[PDB]
Every structure is written in structure tokens, then in C-alpha cells.
Ligand binder design. Structure first.
Ligand code: HEM
Ligand code: HEM
Ligand code: KMM
Ligand code: KMM
Ligand code: H4B
Ligand code: H4B
Ligand code: ZN
Lengths: 414, 417
């Protein structure tokens, strides 16, 4: 019950005590492991008055422990003050310090995130005074500019007002702040990003004038206080993009590939002390494989493998020539090369997983553990030559947390 | 209760009812997932009385007679009756030949970490339950190797030695695989040969094996019959099919001196059928290319040839973001596949193998109500997401008959002397 994880490449063994603090459920049982389910019910997300105070107490307890004020007057006073506020208002407000700690720890606890060694350097933008979609746009432009930083990317989260009665939710309808559009052709194929075909249609259905290109930056669709969402175009000078070329193949630039520099997830829900922040876009920097392996080479995405292997003149007759694997490596060399050339922050999967092993070491030593989801942590190429492949990981759910939530168009009372 | 799994590349959704027939435990709880634990308590086998044995037998026989469309028949009830009296009077029981064949096929069919299970029904089962000595084991294993190898046209096979009785007369193959290369720790700390096999190599040498001390020395068989001290046997070299590894474009690749054997034959697992434990049950199939090209050759703790291969390719080795490791890895795996195909030795690449597993899995859901699958093990160790299993949700649960791990015998064996 005080669990051991072993690294089978190095024989390092770590003892996990942190999982005993786990609160939420995994979706597994003794009879069945659901470790490969993408979205179990638990990972998705009104709070009654009774559920809220224990959630607040557990959070304030760990907060005051983290500042070595556990059991202090200031601790008990804050517990009482929040306890009174919940009794009266049926909710409560976080102190700035508690909001910042909560957001950093939601990242720290994100068991699927390989980049968590950076978790404590997150820049938290308090947007809880926001009231309109235009204000949300302003907060998001400031986030994008701060985080992009002329290509020296910086981690950031912007936190909009917390859920109240569920009818006044703040929501960013986009899945990411910056994402390329997707159009169904009459021809039957897909232009641009197929993953965003439905969202691209909701944008057009709301007024957007699509250039119908291959890499059209989507507008923001912002919902404040539960109102109808509104379109806003992000200033192009704020959207850093990188043309993709290859350091050896001159024909690579002719493929016309580019990608955006800033990965900014915008559709998740931040849970702190029972409070639910339905609009909390956060951003870091890319691991190369997200673009090169998933975005460019997933069959349900840009799906460029065949085209690249063609230009490489690879034997595509048989799968055992591993033409897909060759092409895959070259595409991913090009992504890393392009970002590094344009001085846009990016990390290769080798450095990132090595960092995560170091991070796990640190968390086990200083925290007693590190929830980690192997299915997600292991990169989607060259898995076993990265150290995380050989790392046993314990997956459990700690709070504060980032959770998934239903897409807004399914829920929005129009 | 029904459970759904989704393929996120095709949106195909399958419904699992088979997990309801699951008896054993996973290691996970509502509060922790142990999905990535390599050798969890539940997948191993350290010792079993007449108390729990008849329901295990009854459950198996019910499954068996259902599969042959004889559930509730007179043959079914008489067999249950017969097994029951044999248990209470002798404390164990013997499987019929048909039941053993069924049991071994279904143990493979239930192996949730095995990507090659489309083949499960075409398993050649060799009954070695009349074996009594290590020499008899050697003879059975030789015949298995020769049959399974079939001059490179590999055929799946399993050889099943007598079941455990009191845990003091076990049959065991001390080798982890029937064919495997020696590993030698040198005084300077480096390893010659396969570092994974250093401990077993040292046992063989202690038992009298004259080691050639090369990089690819086929290990001797260390065979334990009836709980006696194990004995050394050399597999006839004419029975050990090997492939020199060359590359279709890089002529310097052959000069690395690499080869591998053609027949992957796991020999240290435990086969559980109807509560009976078969502690010596070597089984063999054919290789997926990445087992050799990725894991055997490129694991840092194995042959670890990435450095020298990338040196000879003249890749940028100063920074990892050149992906020199990924580039060399692909070329090594091309070479492995090219060499086996050129020598007409059966092998499957990870694209073909994972595509077949998806078809197998969908078929199993339709005809069986499910297919237990361990994503962590099914996804190949390179190019994971450009194979279709990466995108496939999988439910992992334990069905019997099963293959289980057991502790290495040198840690449990009571030495006779
Ligand atoms: C700073 C550089 C970062 C890197 C290199 C990184 C890396 C990654 C990668 C590769 C994934 C898998 C994503 C996918 O395959 O779709 C992921 C997931 C995730 N990241 Fe990080 N990330 C970074 C920053 C952040 C930040 C700043 C946050 C939050 C403040 C965060 C929260 C998450 C969460 C919650 C997930 C998993 C979503 C889920 O549960 O399904 N990441 N990360
Ligand atoms: C016919 C071709 C076969 C292929 C291509 C194949 C492929 C594989 C691969 C790649 C693995 C992962 C192994 C590793 O990474 O160490 C595996 C695991 C496994 N295979 Fe198969 N296999 C085949 C035949 C068989 C047969 C004949 C049996 C038994 C009769 C079998 C039983 C298993 C079991 C029990 C495991 C899991 C070991 C564990 O639980 O840790 N396989 N297979
Ligand atoms: C901050 C950051 C850093 C980084 N390197 N990458 C990203 C984008 C990758 C990414 C997430 F991080 C995330 F939390 C959620 C998703 C959606 C998953 C949808 N999928 C289940 C179908 C996602 F795509 C963000
Ligand atoms: C029949 C067959 C077909 C095929 N293609 N490959 C193989 C070898 C791979 C393999 C198994 F299949 C298996 F069941 C067990 C192990 C031991 C795992 C040790 N691990 C905990 C460190 C193993 F290595 C065998
Ligand atoms: C079905 C499976 O869980 C799904 O394809 C997962 C696999 N692992 C992943 N890992 C990461 N990092 N990102 C993903 O989207 C996925 N997809
Ligand atoms: C720690 C982790 O479970 C371990 O490295 C696993 C990962 N997946 C694997 N998958 C296969 N096929 N074979 C393995 O040996 C492993 N090792
Ligand atoms: Zn699990």
C-alpha cells in the first residue's frame, strides 16, 4: 500500500506515498484496468453547499501546509472565514495566493503531462473580474502575447470567473486558442485540419468568413456569463507561426507546411477547492512530436506521410520497408529544425522525457510521489528509446486538477 | 453490465461483455491504476490445495464443453463427476488431451499483452506430460524447436510438461527463452553479448558450461525434471536457425557483425488450466521485427547498438533534437526485416502485426464478447501512433486459462547436490 515503482532501464526504485492522498477515482477496478480509455466519466465534469466545504477544507489544508502554516491561527482563521462564506453565499472566493497555488498544483497533478518539471514557473493571470466576451478577448490577447514572448515562450494560464449556478458559465469554445480550420470539400476530402471541421462550421455558422485555406487560424468564440458566444479574430501579429522546412531536403519547404508556436489549451475545467473554473486557457510550448507525429501524421489529421514518402522516393509497396517510419523521423526532424531556426521554443521528445524522469525523481523525493499516465507520457514515436518507456508509473487523481468538460454547443441554452 | 471501447482514428465502437467472466484481479483499484507496472503481484505465480481446485476445474470444464457445444451433456456431467472424485481421492486431476489443447490455445487467446493472437487457434500443442527426466525434456524441446522452425517457415507450438503436484517436484526450464544469447560481465564493467542474460549465463557456467565468450553464443538448456537439480544440454546447432543482419542499402551494416536467431520461444512462464499449474510449458511463434530491432538491439540495457550505427551513418550525434537515435533506430529495424525476409525466415513488421491485431480484436468482440488487451504492451516500441492500436481503447482483464509469470527457479530451488 506504500507502493514501489521501478525503472527497468536503470533499476531505480521509487516509493510512492502520495497516492494515499488521492481523492477522485481512476475508472479502474480490481477486475478491469481502464488505463487506455481516453475519457472515462471521472476525467470529465452544480456543487451543493454540503459537498463544498470539505473540498475547500482539504485544499486550504494543503495550502497552509505548503507555506508551513499548518495549524496556525492564520490557517484556522481562513478555514473559519471560508466556512462562514460558504454557509452564507453557498460558495467562496480564493485569495490571489490560493488561486496561484491551486493553478500551479493543477498542473503539477496533471498525470498525463510530460512537461510538468516546469510546473512551478507558471504565470497565473487572474481574470475573475472579467464580465464580457470582449473583456475575455482582451485577456486572451494579453495571454497570447505574454506567453508567445517573440518566440521565447512562457507558461501561462488565464483564469476567468468560476462557475456559479451553471447558467452563467464562462467558456472558450475553441479547444485551443490557436488552431487551424477544417473544411469538408464537396470533392469529399478535407481541407486543413479535419479535427476542427465541426468547430470550423460553428464559426462559419456564427458569422466567420473562412478563407478556406489549409492553415487558416480559427477565430475565438468566447462565452461570458452564459451568454451567446462571440467571434473575435486574434491579431495576426500575435499568432507566431513557423514555416516548416527540412535541413537536408530542399523540396520539403514546397510541401507548404507550417504550424503555430503556442499550444494553448482552452476547453478544460480547472477545479480548486471545489470551485470550478470553466474558462482557464493555459499554454506552454510544444514537444516536437505533437506536431510532427500527431498533427501532421495522424490519419485523421493532416495525414502527410504518403506525400512526404513520395517525395523521398521510398519503396511504399510493402509496409516492411518501414517507409512510414522513415518519413516520420524526417518530418519530425523538420519540425524541430524549423522551430529552432526561427528561435521558437520547442522540446524534442528525448529531452522532454529525460526531464520528466528528473521531475519524477524530484517529486518522489520532495513530495512522496508523482501521478503519471504511461499511456500519455510515452511519446508517440520511438517509445522505447526514451527513458519513460521503461519507467513504471502510478496513475491516480489528485486535486487541484484539470478536467475535461462537454463541448459547449451541446449544452448551451441558446 | 456492458462496456464500450472506442477507436479514435475510425470512431468504431465495440461493446465488451466478456470482462464479466473475469475471475483474477488486475492490480488496479478505484484509486490507483497500475496499468504500467511490469510484473504486478497478480501476473506472477509463487501451493494450491484440493479446497479451491474443484471450482477451478468445474469452471474450465464448463467453458470447454460450451465451446464444443456439449454443455450440460452426459459427457459434460460425467467428466465433472470423474474430475471431482479424482480430486478428492488424489488431490489433483489429469486433463484429457482435448482439454489440454483447448486450455493451451485459450491461454494464448487470453494473453492480453500478446499482439500476435490472431494466430491463437493455429497452435501446435505437444503433450509432454509423460516426461520424467531432464534428458526427456531435452528431447521434447529439440523436437519442438525443429518442428517450430520448419526451415524458416515458422509454426507456433507449445510443449507441455507435467503439471505441478506439491511444488516440490516441479518441471522447469531454467532458460527464459529456449534460444537466447549469453551475456558476460567483464572485469572492466562492460558486457560481452546480451546483458539481459548475464545472471543466467553465470549459472550455466557454474553448472559446467564451457562458454565460448563471444557476442552471440547460444545458451545451453538448463532443464529441471520432477524437482531434481537442473541439467545442462546443448541444443544441436543445426537446429538453431540464425539470420545475419544486413541492410538493403548500407553495405557496412553487415560488418557490425550482428545476427539473431529466428525462433522466439518463451520457456519460463506458467500455464494455468482449470487450476492445474504447468510450470514448464515452452511456447514459440515468430518475431515481430521491433522485438529485435528496437528492444534487443537498441535498449540501453541490451545490445545497445544505436551509438555505433549512428556513427557509421554519420548522423549529427551532438544534439538529441537531430533525432539521430530515431534515424538509426529505423535503419536497424529495416535491416532486421530485410534480413529475415531475404533468408525466408518468418517475421512480421509492426504495421502488419498491429493491423492484424485490430482485426482480431474486432472479431473477438463480435464472436466472443470482448478481447482483453494491454495497451501498454500492445503498442509497438517505435512509431507507436502511426500504428492503429495506438488509437484503440483497450480493456485489460484477466481470463483463465492463462500464462503467468513465476519466480526464477534459482531463487526457489531446493538444491539436492
Ligand atoms: C511547458 C511545456 C509543456 C509541455 C512540453 C507539455 C507537454 C504535454 C504533452 C505532450 C501532453 C500530451 C498532449 C496530447 O498528446 O494531446 C500534455 C498534456 C497535458 N498538459 Fe502539458 N505541457 C506543457 C505545459 C503545460 C501547462 C503550462 C499546463 C497547465 C497549466 C499543462 C497541462 C496539461 C494537461 C492537463 C494535460 C493532459 C490533458 C488530459 O488530461 O488529457 N501542460 N502536456
Ligand atoms: C505467432 C507470432 C507471435 C507474435 C508476432 C507475438 C508477438 C508478441 C509480442 C511482440 C509480445 C510482447 C513481447 C515483449 O515485448 O517482450 C508478446 C507477448 C506475449 N505473447 Fe505473443 N506472439 C506470438 C505468438 C505467441 C504464442 C504462440 C504464444 C503462446 C502460446 C504467445 C503468448 C504471449 C504471451 C503470454 C505474451 C505476454 C507476456 C507477458 O504477459 O508479459 N505469443 N507477443
Ligand atoms: C499547454 C500545452 C502544452 C503542450 N506541449 N501541448 C498542448 C496541447 C496538447 C493538449 C494538451 F496539453 C491538453 F491538456 C489537452 C489536449 C486536448 C486533447 C484532446 N484529445 C483527448 C483528443 C491537447 F491536445 C498544451
Ligand atoms: C512466442 C513469442 C513470440 C514473439 N513474437 N516473441 C516472443 C518473445 C517476447 C516475449 C514473450 F512473447 C513473452 F510471452 C514473454 C516474454 C518475457 C518478457 C520479459 N519482460 C518481463 C522483461 C517475452 F520476452 C515470444
Ligand atoms: C486509445 C488511447 O488511449 C489514445 O489513442 C491515446 C493514447 N495515448 C495518447 N497519448 C498522448 N500523449 N496523447 C494522446 O492523444 C493519446 N491518445
Ligand atoms: C514500465 C513499463 O511497463 C515497461 O517498460 C513495459 C512497457 N511496455 C512494454 N511493451 C512490450 N511489448 N514489452 C515490454 O517489455 C514492455 N515494457
Ligand atoms: Zn488500471
Amino acid at each position: 500500500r506504500f507502493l514501489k515503482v521501478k525503472n527497468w532501464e536503470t533499476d531505480v526504485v521509487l516509493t510512492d506515498t502520495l497516492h494515499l492522498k488521492s481523492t477522485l477515482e481512476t475508472g479502474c477496478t480490481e477486475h478491469i484496468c481502464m488505463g487506455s480509455i481516453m475519457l472515462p466519466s471521472q476525467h470529465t465534469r452544480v456543487r451543493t453547499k454540503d459537498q463544498l466545504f470539505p473540498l475547500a477544507k482539504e485544499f486550504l489544508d494543503q495550502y497552509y501546509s505548503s507555506i508551513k502554516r499548518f495549524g496556525s491561527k492564520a490557517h484556522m482563521d481562513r478555514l473559519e472565514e471560508v466556512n462562514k462564506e460558504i454557509e452564507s453565499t453557498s460558495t467562496y472566493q480564493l485569495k490571489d495566493t490560493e488561486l496561484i497555488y491551486g493553478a500551479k498544483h493543477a498542473w503539477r497533478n496533471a498525470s498525463r503531462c510530460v512537461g510538468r518539471i516546469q510546473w512551478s514557473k507558471l504565470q497565473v493571470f487572474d481574470a475573475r473580474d472579467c464580465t464580457t466576451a470582449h473583456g475575455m478577448f482582451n485577456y486572451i490577447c494579453n495571454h497570447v502575447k505574454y506567453a508567445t514572448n517573440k518566440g521565447n515562450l512562457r507558461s501561462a494560464i488565464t483564469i476567468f470567473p468560476q462557475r456559479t449556478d451553471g447558467k452563467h458559465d464562462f467558456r472558450v469554445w475553441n479547444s485551443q486558442l490557436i488552431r487551424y480550420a477544417g473544411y469538408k470539400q464537396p470533392d469529399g476530402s478535407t481541407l486543413g485540419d479535419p479535427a476542427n471541421v465541426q468547430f470550423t462550421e460553428i464559426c462559419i455558422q456564427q458569422g466567420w468568413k473562412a478563407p478556406r485555406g489549409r492553415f487558416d487560424v480559427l477565430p475565438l468564440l468566447l462565452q461570458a456569463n452564459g451568454n451567446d458566444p462571440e467571434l473575435f479574430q486574434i491579431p495576426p501579429e500575435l499568432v507566431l507561426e513557423v514555416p516548416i522546412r527540412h535541413p537536408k531536403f530542399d523540396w520539403f519547404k514546397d510541401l507548404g507546411l507550417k504550424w503555430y508556436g503556442l499550444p494553448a489549451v482552452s476547453n478544460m475545467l480547472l477545479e480548486i477547492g471545489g470551485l470550478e473554473f470553466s474558462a482557464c486557457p493555459f499554454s506552454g510550448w510544444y514537444m516536437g512530436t505533437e506536431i510532427g507525429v500527431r498533427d501532421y501524421c495522424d490519419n485523421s489529421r493532416y495525414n502527410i506521410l504518403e506525400e512526404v514518402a513520395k517525395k523521398m522516393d521510398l519503396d511504399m509497396r510493402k509496409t516492411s520497408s518501414l517507409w512510414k517510419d522513415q518519413a516520420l523521423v524526417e518530418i519530425n526532424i523538420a519540425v524541430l529544425y524549423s522551430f529552432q531556426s526561427d528561435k521558437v521554443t520547442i522540446v524534442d521528445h528525448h529531452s522532454a522525457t529525460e526531464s520528466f524522469i528528473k521531475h519524477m525523481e524530484n517529486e518522489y523525493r520532495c513530495r512522496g510521489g508523482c501521478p503519471a499516465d504511461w499511456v500519455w507520457i510515452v511519446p508517440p514515436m520511438s517509445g522505447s528509446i526514451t527513458p519513460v518507456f521503461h519507467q513504471e508509473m502510478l496513475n491516480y487523481r489528485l486535486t487541484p486538477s484539470f478536467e475535461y468538460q462537454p463541448d459547449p454547443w451541446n449544452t448551451h441554452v441558446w
